[PDB]
Amino acid sequence: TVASISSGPKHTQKVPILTANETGATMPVLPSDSIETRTTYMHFNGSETDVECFLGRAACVHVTEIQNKDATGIDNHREAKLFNDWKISLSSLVQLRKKLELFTYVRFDSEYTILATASQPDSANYSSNLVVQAMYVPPGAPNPKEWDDYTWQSASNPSVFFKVGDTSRFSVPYVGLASAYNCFYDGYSHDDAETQYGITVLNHMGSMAFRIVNEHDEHKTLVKIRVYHRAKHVEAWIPRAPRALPYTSIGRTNYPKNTEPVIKKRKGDIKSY
Amino acid sequence: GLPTTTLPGSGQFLTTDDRQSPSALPNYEPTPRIHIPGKVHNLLEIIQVDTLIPMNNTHTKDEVNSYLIPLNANRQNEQVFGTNLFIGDGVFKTTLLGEIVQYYTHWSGSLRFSLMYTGPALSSAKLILAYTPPGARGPQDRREAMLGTHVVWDIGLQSTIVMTIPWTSGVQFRYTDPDTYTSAGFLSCWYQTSLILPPETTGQVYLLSFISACPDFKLRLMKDTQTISQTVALTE
Amino acid sequence: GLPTTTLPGSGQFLTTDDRQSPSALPNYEPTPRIHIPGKVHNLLEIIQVDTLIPMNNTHTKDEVNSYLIPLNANRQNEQVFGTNLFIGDGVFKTTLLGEIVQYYTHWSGSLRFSLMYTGPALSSAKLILAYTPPGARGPQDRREAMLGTHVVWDIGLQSTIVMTIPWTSGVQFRYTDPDTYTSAGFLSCWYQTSLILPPETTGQVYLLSFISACPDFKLRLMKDTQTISQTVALTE
Amino acid sequence: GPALSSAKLILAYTPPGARGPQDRREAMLGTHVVWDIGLQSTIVMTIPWTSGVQFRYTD
Amino acid sequence: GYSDRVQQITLGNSTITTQEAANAVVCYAEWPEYLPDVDASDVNKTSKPDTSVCRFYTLDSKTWTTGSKGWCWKLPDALKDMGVFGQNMFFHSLGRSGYTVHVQCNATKFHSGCLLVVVIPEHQLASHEGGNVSVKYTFTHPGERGIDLSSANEVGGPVKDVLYNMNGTLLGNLLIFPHQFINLRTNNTATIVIPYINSVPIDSMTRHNNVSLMVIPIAPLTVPTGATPSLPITVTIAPMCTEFSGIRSKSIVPQ
Amino acid sequence: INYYKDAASTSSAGQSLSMDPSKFTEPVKDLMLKGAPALN
Amino acid sequence: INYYKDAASTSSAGQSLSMDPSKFTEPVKDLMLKGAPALN
Numbered sequence A: 001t002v003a004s005i006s007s008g009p010k011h012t013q014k015v016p017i018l019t020a021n022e023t024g025a026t027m028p029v030l031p032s033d034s035i036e037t038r039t040t041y042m043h044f045n046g047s048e049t050d051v052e053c054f055l056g057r058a059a060c061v062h063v064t065e066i067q068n069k070d071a072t073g074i075d076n077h078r079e080a081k082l083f084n085d086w087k088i089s090l091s092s093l094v095q096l097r098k099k100l101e102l103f104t105y106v107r108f109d110s111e112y113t114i115l116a117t118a119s120q121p122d123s124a125n126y127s128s129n130l131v132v133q134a135m136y137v138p139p140g141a142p143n144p145k146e147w148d149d150y151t152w153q154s155a156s157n158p159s160v161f162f163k164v165g166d167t168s169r170f171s172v173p174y175v176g177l178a179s180a181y182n183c184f185y186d187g188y189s190h191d192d193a194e195t196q197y198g199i200t201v202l203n204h205m206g207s208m209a210f211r212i213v214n215e216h217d218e219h220k221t222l223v224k225i226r227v228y229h230r231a232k233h234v235e236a237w238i239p240r241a242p243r244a245l246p247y248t249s250i251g252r253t254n255y256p257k258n259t260e261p262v263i264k265k266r267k268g269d270i271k272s273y
Numbered sequence B, C: 001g002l003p004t005t006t007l008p009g010s011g012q013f014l015t016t017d018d019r020q021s022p023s024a025l026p027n028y029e030p031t032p033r034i035h036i037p038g039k040v041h042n043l044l045e046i047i048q049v050d051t052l053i054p055m056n057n058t059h060t061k062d063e064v065n066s067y068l069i070p071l072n073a074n075r076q077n078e079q080v081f082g083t084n085l086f087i088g089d090g091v092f093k094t095t096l097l098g099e100i101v102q103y104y105t106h107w108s109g110s111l112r113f114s115l116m117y118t119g120p121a122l123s124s125a126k127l128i129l130a131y132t133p134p135g136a137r138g139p140q141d142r143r144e145a146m147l148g149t150h151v152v153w154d155i156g157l158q159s160t161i162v163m164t165i166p167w168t169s170g171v172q173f174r175y176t177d178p179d180t181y182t183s184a185g186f187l188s189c190w191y192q193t194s195l196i197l198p199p200e201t202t203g204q205v206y207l208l209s210f211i212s213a214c215p216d217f218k219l220r221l222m223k224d225t226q227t228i229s230q231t232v233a234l235t236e
Numbered sequence D: 001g002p003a004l005s006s007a008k009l010i011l012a013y014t015p016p017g018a019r020g021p022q023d024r025r026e027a028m029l030g031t032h033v034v035w036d037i038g039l040q041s042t043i044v045m046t047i048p049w050t051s052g053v054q055f056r057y058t059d
Numbered sequence E: 001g002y003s004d005r006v007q008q009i010t011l012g013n014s015t016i017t018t019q020e021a022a023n024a025v026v027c028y029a030e031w032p033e034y035l036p037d038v039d040a041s042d043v044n045k046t047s048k049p050d051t052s053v054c055r056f057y058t059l060d061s062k063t064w065t066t067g068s069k070g071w072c073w074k075l076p077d078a079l080k081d082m083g084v085f086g087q088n089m090f091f092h093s094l095g096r097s098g099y100t101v102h103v104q105c106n107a108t109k110f111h112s113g114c115l116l117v118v119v120i121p122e123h124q125l126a127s128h129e130g131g132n133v134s135v136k137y138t139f140t141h142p143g144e145r146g147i148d149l150s151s152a153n154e155v156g157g158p159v160k161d162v163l164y165n166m167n168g169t170l171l172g173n174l175l176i177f178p179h180q181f182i183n184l185r186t187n188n189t190a191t192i193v194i195p196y197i198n199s200v201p202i203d204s205m206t207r208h209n210n211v212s213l214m215v216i217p218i219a220p221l222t223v224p225t226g227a228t229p230s231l232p233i234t235v236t237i238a239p240m241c242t243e244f245s246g247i248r249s250k251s252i253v254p255q
Numbered sequence F, G: 001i002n003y004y005k006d007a008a009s010t011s012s013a014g015q016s017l018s019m020d021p022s023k024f025t026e027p028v029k030d031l032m033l034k035g036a037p038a039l040n
C-alpha cells in the first residue's frame, strides 16, 4: 500500500485544495495535492484501532465489599455487608464509560472476571479460606434477604462459587432487550409528567449478589470484590463528540455546576507558539 | 491421565489476553440485529471527519469565541495566529482528533488543517499559511515563514482552504504526549496582502479552523487518556 | 510432560456450565425405558394449553368464584371486566402461563384470551372485547374501547370466543416482571347490546375465561420464580 | 427589487372547503411553494385542479 | 447549467426552491426507507398516509440577533401539531419516520455570520442542577417552539450552555454529526435528509424523540452599517416515509 | 478450537478490516469531485 | 471427545428440537378443523 505517491510541480485550473466546508463534507485532501512528494508505503494496517480491539480489554467496572462475621443479632444482613449486591451497570466507573460513549448504540457479549481479596484489619490468628458465591439476580426473581436465604439455592439462576484470592470468569451473551444497548436515550418510560429521563429506565439489567459461603470464625474478615468487564464481538453505531466535562451520575449526561474551563488558555497571544 | 507441567504465569489475569469462557446463560437467544445507519469499524474512520479547533484560546472561561480567529482590515505584512503542533495538547487537545490521539501512545501521518472564511461576500483577502518542520523556531515574520511549507490562500467564492501538514520526520513515529525529540513543528498564518472590507461595512471578520487526519495516519499502542478521571464511583 | 498455563476462572464452580465427569457407578446398567404417553420436550409445548384465569379476583380468600366473571341481564353500554396485561402478575400470575413466564426474564409473542359462556341456552348476548395497545389509558367507556383491537362476540351455539392479543411492540422483548417502558396494554370487555334471559329464568350468568400463548411466543433468560420460597429445609 | 437584495416568500393555494388562511401556519398546510429570490427572477406556481365536480362556472 | 446551488424539493403537495444551496447532507449516507419485514417485530400491518403526512411543515420563525445563543428542536416533537402528521402521532401506539430538514436564512453581500445546522441522534440533555436531577418531560417536549438556548435556566428543564451541547461535550466536536453550515457569504439554506435511526424497528413517538435539530450562530451576525441588527431564521421540515402502527384511543401526554 | 457450545463464549472477534469513512466524511447528496469547484 | 467410558458421564443432551403440543392442546378423538364449526 502506498502512503504517498510521487507528485511533481502543478500549474493547473484544477485546484483540489479550495473547497466549501459549508457542505458538511471533509474532502479527502493529501500531501501530494499541495507539495511535491516521493513514494512511501504504509507498512501498517490499523489493526489496533478496530473497535473490537478498542473495547476488547478488561476494565474495572465495580468494586464492592462484603464481610464474614457472626450474623447473630444482625437485623439487616444487607446493611451489615453480610452480603452486598450490585446493580449491574457499565458507567459507575469512568475510564470505560468515556470509551463506550464515543458511540450511541453498542452491541457485544461480556466476559466478566471477578477478583476477590481478603483483608483482616484487626488482630486475627490467621487468614481463613473463604469461598465467595456471586449470583445473578435478574429482575423478577427473589432477591436475597439474609446471607443464607432460600434464594441462594439458585436453582434456576446462574451462580459461580470461587475462593477469595482467586478469580472467577465466565461470559454472558448480549442480554439487551433491543438490537443494541442505548448509550444514550432522549426519552422516558412513558408519557408521565414526573417520570425519570435518560436510560436508567432502559438498562434494566437487574443486579448481581455476592456473599461468603463460610460461617464465621472468631475474627472478622473483609472481602473486597472487583468486577472487570471485557466486550467481545463488538458492534458500534453512530459516533458522537467525546465527553468533555466530568460525570455526576450513572445514566444522565449531567455535568457539575461551576465546573472549570476545559479548554487550556494560552500563556500568551493567539500569535504565540 | 495425560502428564502436564504448568509454566510461570499460570493463574495470572492479564486484562488484555483473549480466551474462551463458559457462558453463564447456556442456550439463550439474543435479540435479532436490525439495520441502523452509521456503523463505525475503526477509530481511523472517524478521525478523518474534521472538527473545529478552539484556536483563539486566549479567553478565560470556555466560550464560543475561542473558535473564532479574528482578522483586521487593512493590516499588511502581519501575523494572524501561531501554534506548535503538539496534537495531544494545547489547541488540538479537545478536538476529536486530539481526543482520540490521546487514547494512543504513538502517531504518524499527515494532518489536514483548513480555514473557512466568514467575512462579507464583497470583501477580499490573501493569507499565507506556513508549516515549519521541526528544527527551526516558530517563524517570527512572513519572510521567515514563507521559506517552509506554505499555501497563498486567495479568499473567494470557494470559502475554505485545506492545508496539509505533510509528514516530515526522521523517526517514523512521534508520541502524542509532548516529546522534544519527537516534536513536529509550528503552524503560522500572515496577511499576504491584507483583508479589505466593502463600504458600509466594519469591524473584525473571523476565520473558523478545522483539523482532521489524512488517510496516511497511523496511531498505535493504546493507553489511558489524561482527559478523564474521577474521585468516587458514581451512582444512580 | 506437556507445558500448560492455567487461566483466570480455574477451579471455579459455575452452576450452569456443562462438562463431563467420572461416573461413580462404573458399568451399571439402567432399567430399560418402557413407553409412557405424555412426554414433554419444551416448556413452549405446554404454555399453549389454555387454563382458567381467576379474573374475579375481588374476593378475600381463594374461592372457585374468582374464576367466574358475572354478567347482568338487561344492562346496556356498560363494562364487564378490565385488567392490565402484566402476564407475570395480578390475575395472570397463578395461571400456567403466568406460572411459567415467571421462570424467564423476557417474553415476546401473541397471547390467546378466550371466554366460554355458561348462561341458559335460551338466552342471548353480544359482548365486545377490546385490547388497548401500550400508550393510552385503560379505556373508560366502550367508545374509547372500540377504537383499538376488538371482537364483537355473538353468544350462540358455539360457546367460546378466542380473542388474540397480537404482539404490538416497539422493543422486541418485554420483561415478565412489571416494567413500565416494557408494558403491554389493557384488556376490557363491555356489553355490545346486552344479555337477555328467557322467561322463567333469573339472576347472574357467568363467563369462564382462559389464557394460553400463541405459537408466536418466545421466553428467554431463565431465572428463579418469586412464586415459591422456604425458611427451613423440609424433612421426611 | 435591487439585485443586491434578497427575500424568501411562500405562496399558498387553499383548496375549497377551508377559509382564506389567516396566518402562514394556516397557509403552509395546503399547496405552497417556498420561493427563494435569486438570479432567476420569476417563480411559477400552479393551482392544480382540485375538485369534486369536473367543471366549475366562471361566474 | 445545474449548480450545486439551485435546488427544488417537491414532497407531497409542497415544494421548496433554493437558489443558493451548498449541496445537501444525507445522514450517514442513507436515505429514508420503510421498515422491511426481515426487521419487523410487531405483527400489525402499518398505515402509510403518504402524501398527507409527507409534505413540508414550516415552523414559526426565529430571530437571529447579535446576542443569540442558538435554538434546539426535537423530532418528532416539533411536528406534534402539524396537520394529519400530528393526529396520526397521538392516535397510534407506534410510528416511524425520516425527514427532510430545510433551514433558511438570507441576508445580503454586506452581512457576515455563520450558523451550524446539525442533527444529533439520541440527544439526551443534561439537568443544569448537576448530580442526578432529571429533566422533566415538558422541558424536552417544547413542540414547535423548540428550546431557546439563550432563555434562562428553569426548574426541571435542561442546561442551555452552548459550549457544551446541552450534554457535557464541546461545541467544536458537533461536526462529527451530519451537519451543514449557513455562511451568509456562501449559503442561504441548509438541507439534511434524516433516515430513521433507532435500536428498535419502530418506537413510541411521544415518549422518545430520536433526533434534535440544532441551529447555532458560531460567527456572530454582523450587519452592514445602520442596517437593522437582526435576520429571521425559518425551519421547514417534512416527514418522509412515515408509517404508523397500533391504532387505538389517542394518547394523553403531560401538560 | 472452540471448547464451548455457545457463541458468546468464543474469544474476541478479528479485524473488521472494513473501513469506509465516507458515511462520515462525505455524506453529501450530490457527489463532490476533488479538484472540481465545490460550488458551481 | 468423551474422556470417560460410561454414558452418564457425558455432558448435557442437545435440544430435543422435538416440539409437538398437539398431545396436550388437541387430544380430541374426532379431528377439529379451525374455521369449521366446533359442534356440527
Ligand SMILES: Cc1cc(CCCCCCCOc2ccc(C3=N[C@@H](C)CO3)cc2)on1
Residues within 6 Å of the ligand: A088, A089, A090, A091, A100, A106, A110, A134, A135, A136, A158, A159, A160, A170, A172, A175, A181, A182, A183, A203, A205, A208, B024
Ligand atoms: C454468576 C453470574 C453472574 C452473572 C452476570 C450476568 C451478566 C448480566 C449483565 C449484562 C450486561 O449488562 C450491561 C449493562 C449495561 C450496559 C451498557 N450501558 C451503557 C452505557 C452501555 O452498555 C451493557 C451491559 O452471570 N452469572
